[PDB]
Amino acid sequence: AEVYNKDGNKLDLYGKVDGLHYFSDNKDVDGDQTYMRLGFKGETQVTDQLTGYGQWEYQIQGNSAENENNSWTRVAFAGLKFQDVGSFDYGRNYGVVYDVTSWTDVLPEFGGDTYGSDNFMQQRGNGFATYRNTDFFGLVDGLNFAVQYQGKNGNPSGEGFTSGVTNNGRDGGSITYDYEGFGIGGAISSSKRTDAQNTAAYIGNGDRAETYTGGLKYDANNIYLAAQYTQTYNATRVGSLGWANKAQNFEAVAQYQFDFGLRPSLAYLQSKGKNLGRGYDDEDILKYVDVGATYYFNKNMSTYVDYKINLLDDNQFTRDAGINTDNIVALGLVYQF
Template sequence: MKRNLLAIAIPALLIAGTASASIEVWNKDGNKVDFYGRVYALNYLTDRDNQTGEGDKTTARLGMSGQTQISDSLSGYGRWEYEAKTGSYADNETRYAYAGLNFGDFGSFDYGRNDGVLKTLTSYTDVLPEFGGDASNNDIYALTARTKAVATYRNSDFFGLVDGLRFAVQYADNGDNSSTQYLNHHERTGHDSAEAWGSVIDWDVLDTGLSIGAGYAQTGGHKDAKAWSAGVKYDNDNLYLAALYIQGKQKAGWDNASTTRKADDLKTKGFELVAQYGIDFDIGRLTPSVAYIQHKVKNASSLTNDSGLKGNDLAKYVDIGLTYDFNKNLSAIVDYKINLLDKNDIGARRSLYEDGTFTKSQIKATAKDTVALGLIYQF
């Protein structure tokens, strides 16, 4: 019975993520409800006035996760999370909303708004204090970030036979599930929906601290967006090392995503490297980190809206960061993004396309360095 209860609880905890510091508000007769939240006071600083994306980035989140015990080997669970953004780009978003059943050693199944299946791998390197996580972008790589209307089956420990061997399969039936939309936001009208599916497998290798994984995802219809990814991480004591490779391909490209006209294959690829080391003090823990991120598209100069560009990089930077955890509820971060983009790189212009028109000065600004300063309170 204990083994079955663990098999039910562990996947729910993995899915809940930020709920690790949650407040238990109900636990009776096999029913449990937790609430969790976060206030992230954050500001981006640059060495250039009016740079795109600078300024206040403060957010607040509130969420709940629940579990109900049906039998020794069957339980139900659900999660909801909402985020409100402040500043000049104030917006609101339902980040998660799903419910499911867990069958113990036979795995779990849920449906709703949830992470794309390849998030299992992109999360290896999406651990920086603020920046990073460029691979978790549904506009470039299919099913790598949160998306709506996804049905997901997950299995931990391979039906109870192999410790640490996990796999998942996922089907998405609508909407923002993949790179079926443009990167340039102001043209994102008229796109049609596409189904998508994907799978991932990863393994915690014995008790070594080493994990390896690989996955694949693609959309249906004329867009035919595909993504392949592989990752490795080492997490043991205070040391954390991770590497990710991801590759994408879209037949309709970005600029033809709302049409039925075929276009030359649009190919993207990227890799991310991260190293972190935790240092414990009498009060709190300091974690320095360093990372290198690069994503590029093949032959950027041949794309319709990007003719004449000399650089193929979508993102290219070195990241140096510090996180100080006072305790499990309060943390402070500083994250320095050393931008290696050139003004002629495609990545220096794509972030401006939502403005319609832009100046050479604005283009140069997107290739500048950025420092993020933040204070995080969570429960």
């Protein structure tokens, strides 16, 4: 909600509670998923060219006993929006690879898991410096691009420590084009991978991590259609088994937003692990049809249903990796401010 807004400077304290439940054979996603997040957005406008900004978003699970704490930081950064030039922001942000792969992460609840968090630059993680430019400098229009650099986030440990660091399921650029509905967008990224993430513990001759990504979308008059395809080298988490030498990830959504508020979606997603290590071979990391819908009471409240028809078999594979393979359904009631 746009709270404070006085002389140049304006705030938007914001958030939602989401009363969310999951039915699933998988009693390890089963049941109660309530959660909430709050966040602020901020801009002080410093001149007419130049404007500063910040953003902080933070989720806190609301499905556990006062015993238990849990909740983490989603996004936290400051930057400067220059005017022709572009914006810059350092901080915990979304990886660029996310400018295009986001084209399809919009299911009522599911999708946006052919990548993950603190997964190089695919999606969200620490230490991002991003540069963004909007219609190639005001001079060609709904063409734009982003380049970003992330510094090493290494070991908690006693060889390559980093201040603020981690285990390693947790240690680029894009351009995209417009002419009213219809987006194409490429994004390429590449990350040196640390010696910790490189040790015959589960999987990855990991040299750099590379993802290569093209996307399509079409959005206007109530129709939302999009596709993103991207293949990765040494960068798709395959369970907790370490990473996936090659993997081809495909994701297409289809949706219609009704004048009265209901908005069905239909989606396919999958991820095909290519030449994996350690037996295994060619093997599907994710495979599922999504069917579901959400309903907006207004722009402030709503409910959704979601139904992952889970297209993968059990095997010493999935089981190895601890990849859920069952269906789930989600039911959610949510109020956002």
